[PDB]
Amino acid sequence: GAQVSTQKTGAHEIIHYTNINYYKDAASNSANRQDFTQDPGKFTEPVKDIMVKSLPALN
C-alpha cells in the first residue's frame, strides 16, 4: 500500500519517491510540504461590486 510522488526539483533542466504509512493514526504521518496552491482574493480585492482595474471605478 505504497504511494509514489514527485520530488521537489529545479526548473529549465519528475524524479519519484515512495511512501508507506506505518502507524494507525493520521497524526503520525509526515508533514504535507508540497501543497503550493493559493487564493489571495479574500484579503486583496475584498470588496463588493467587483472593479475592472481599467475603469476609474468611481463616479
Binding site: 506505518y22 503520525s28 501543497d35 493559493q38 486583496t44 468611481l58
Partner: protein, 238 residues
C-alpha cells in the same frame, strides 16, 4: 535477522525533518473541522496587501502618527522635490517594520516587482502634479528633477481619483536579491518630486499630507527561512 548497515547521520536530531513518529494518545477522536472565514494557505497572500509606509521617520516623528504623514505644500520655486528612500524592503529603515518587510525578514532572498500607492489626503480644491520616480543602481542618487526623469517615472495629476500607483519592476541581473544589505544586489532609489506646485484658493489650508502604501505584485517570491533579526529575548517570560 535481516542484514542492515547503519549509515552516517544515524541517531541525530535535525530540526527540519519530515519523519514519522508514534502517537502518545492512540485512536484519539479529533473534533470536527469548521469553516472559519479567512484562511491563509501561503504567506504571500498577506504580503500582497497594502500597508502604510512610515516615511517621515525623521528622528522624533517615530513616536507619533507623524511618521506616516508626508508633508506637501505650495513651494515658491518649482523643479523641486518631495522625498526619497532606498528600495530595500527589509534593510532600509523606511519600510523595515512594514507588513511586507516583516514577512520578508524571516527570509533571505526576494524577487519580483513592488507596488507603491500614494493617497493624497488634502482638500478637494487643491491640485498639483508630482514626479514619482525609480532609479536603477549604477549611478548615484539623482540630485535634480531632470536627472530623476531619466529613470522609471510617472507624472501624477491629483484629481477625483485621489491615488496613483508607482510600479517598480524587476530590473536585475540575478534572479534573487538579498533581503539584508550587500553591495552585490543593490536595488535602486525611490524619489518623489514637486514637478509643479500645490495650488489652493483663498481660505483653504496650504499644507496637506501624502500617505504612502507598499505591497507586492503577483510575481513576488521569498526563499531562505531564517530567524528574524528583531526578536530579542533575555530571560523566560513568566
Amino acid at each position: 535477522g535481516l542484514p542492515v548497515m547503519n549509515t552516517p547521520g544515524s541517531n541525530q536530531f535535525l530540526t527540519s525533518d519530515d519523519y514519522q513518529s508514534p502517537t502518545a494518545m492512540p485512536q484519539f477522536d479529533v473534533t470536527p473541522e469548521m469553516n472559519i472565514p479567512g484562511e491563509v494557505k501561503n504567506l504571500m497572500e498577506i504580503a500582497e496587501v497594502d500597508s502604510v509606509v512610515p516615511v517621515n521617520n525623521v528622528n522624533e516623528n517615530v513616536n507619533s502618527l507623524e511618521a506616516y504623514r508626508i508633508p506637501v505644500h505650495s513651494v515658491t520655486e518649482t523643479g523641486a522635490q518631495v522625498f526619497g528612500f532606498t528600495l530595500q524592503p527589509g534593510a532600509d529603515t523606511v519600510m523595515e517594520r512594514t507588513l511586507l518587510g516583516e514577512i520578508l525578514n524571516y527570509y533571505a532572498n526576494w524577487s519580483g516587482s513592488i507596488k507603491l500607492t500614494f493617497m493624497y489626503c488634502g482638500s478637494a480644491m487643491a491640485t498639483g502634479k508630482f514626479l514619482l520616480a525609480y532609479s536603477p543602481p549604477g549611478a548615484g542618487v539623482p540630485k535634480n528633477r531632470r536627472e530623476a526623469m531619466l529613470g522609471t517615472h510617472i507624472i501624477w495629476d491629483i484629481g477625483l481619483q485621489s491615488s496613483c500607483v508607482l510600479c517598480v519592476p524587476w530590473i536585475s541581473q540575478t534572479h534573487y536579491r538579498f533581503v539584508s544589505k550587500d553591495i552585490y544586489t543593490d536595488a535602486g532609489f525611490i524619489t518623489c518630486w514637486y514637478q509643479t506646485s500645490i495650488v489652493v484658493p483663498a481660505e483653504v489650508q496650504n499644507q496637506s499630507v501624502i500617505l504612502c502604501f507598499v505591497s507586492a505584485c503577483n510575481d513576488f517570491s521569498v526563499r531562505l527561512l531564517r530567524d528574524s533579526p528583531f526578536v530579542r529575548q533575555t530571560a523566560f517570560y513568566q
